Design a binder for this molecule. Structure first.
Ligand SMILES: O=P([O-])(O)O
Ligand SMILES: O=P([O-])(O)O
Ligand SMILES: O=P([O-])(O)O
Ligand SMILES: O=P([O-])(O)O
Ligand SMILES: O=P([O-])(O)O
Ligand SMILES: O=P([O-])(O)O
Ligand SMILES: [Zn+2]
Ligand SMILES: [Zn+2]
Lengths: 238, 238
């Protein structure tokens, strides 16, 4: 009949810009579309991330844990310098590609040192991996139980492990578009770069994360529904 | 302000008995409780599932697939004859054990020949299994992806495979309680038997099922919240 489970009741009740905004994330990312793809002409990312950062792991109390970093983790793109602030995860992925979401999505949030605005790199996490992603692994182990608490992690964290390998041609193809934080206050003016290439994590880790989101008592999600592109352009650095 | 993702939005708005009835499923099943427990004194289940070749797999448009059986598969418990009509699944589990849901719950739905009620057997699926479960596997393989569509299974689907292994005393401990269907119209007078011993399953299959629940484009759940026990008691045949 006309009964369903439906989507989580949360997001559609969010107020503020979350409802009125016209530049909201996440959005769909067409990549097998018939429409012309506007090249972002921005170059390739160059990453200067540390290999054993010492991090605070916060429990955001909204599902994901948040691994915070000290300065000196820099990513370079389009003549700007982005500094890494923190990473966290969402399951399922928040962006889709051609309408389809992935098992998880890592978000690596940066400050644009050039501008002061927020930049966010999104990486899709796919099931099927056989090597435990140590960044995600450490972030699940150190994650404090009490919401809004934060323990320092004993192990180091290499955030490079949440980025795609360079392809056979040396690229890390991506798409770029202006958007917003995916959680309240859903603030706009955020620059989004989303990597086309997923990383393969093991299925155990994805379930571990959904378990974390469900507070070790069930399996839950923490993703916002797709938003309307509106008059925005997605730019492709393939 | 405060905000969350929440749970799915559909269930709390299901109407009719879903809302008014006082014998609804699922429920939390205490086990590590001081409280004394009423023994079911019903003996152990015996299974005579035979006519499992040539059965249909149906996509219900409500998340799970449903493996329909022909007449002739019987289960016996107490003085009672349970005729298997179909099985399907939920992720995460619908019933909880001390407030803990498992990754999946299998529901084998029978007609109780002896009372003219339905009877539902309920098995928890945990991750961490080394062998694909064959019933769940074929269910996933054969299940048509188009909603409302059904397809005959080429291979035979042995429903016994969804039952936990006998304990080191020859038994499969379970709890019994009168409840309802977990989906609308939530009709009451369903006999629930929930087994206490989960079956371990490869994480691949759990994500594959959550994938199926998500129209093969996301990962989603299909579970109703827990329901008040009210006047009932839970019978334990441990
Ligand atoms: O440091 P990368 O950007 O060459 O990996
Ligand atoms: O920035 P490079 O040294 O990884 O090419
Ligand atoms: O990609 P899978 O086979 O781990 O589900
Ligand atoms: O950084 P997010 O949580 O707003 O996506
Ligand atoms: O393989 P497990 O650790 O997810 O059970
Ligand atoms: O068999 P159920 O899922 O309607 O309880
Ligand atoms: Zn995020
Ligand atoms: Zn069910």
């Amino acid at each position: 009949a006309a009964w369903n489970y439906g989507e989580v009741a949360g997001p559609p009740t969010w107020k503020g810009v979350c409802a009125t905004g016209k530049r909201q994330s996440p959005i769909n990312i067409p990549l097998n579309t018939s429409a012309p793809k506007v090249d972002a002409e921005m170059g390739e990312f160059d990453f200067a991330y540390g290999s054993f950062e010492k991090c605070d792991v916060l429990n955001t109390g909204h599902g994901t844990m948040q691994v915070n970093f000290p300065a000196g983790n820099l990513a370079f793109i389009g003549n700007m310098e982005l500094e890494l602030l923190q990473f966290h995860f969402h399951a399922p992925s928040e962006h889709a590609m051609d309408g389809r979401r992935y098992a998880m999505e890592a978000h690596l949030v940066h400050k644009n040192k050039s501008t002061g605005n927020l930049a966010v790199l999104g990486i899709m996490l796919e099931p099927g991996g056989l090597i435990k992603n140590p960044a995600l692994s450490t972030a699940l182990e150190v994650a404090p139980e009490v919401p809004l608490a934060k323990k320092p992690s004993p192990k180091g964290i290499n955030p490079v492990m949440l980025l795609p390998k360079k392809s056979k041609a040396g690229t890390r193809p991506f798409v770029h578009y202006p958007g917003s934080l995916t959680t309240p206050p859903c603030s706009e003016g955020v620059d989004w770069f989303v990597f086309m290439q997923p990383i393969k994590v093991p299925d155990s880790q994805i379930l571990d994360f959904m378990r974390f989101v469900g507070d070790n008592k069930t399996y839950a999600t923490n993703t916002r529904p797709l938003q309307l592109l509106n008059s925005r352009l997605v730019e492709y650095e393939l």
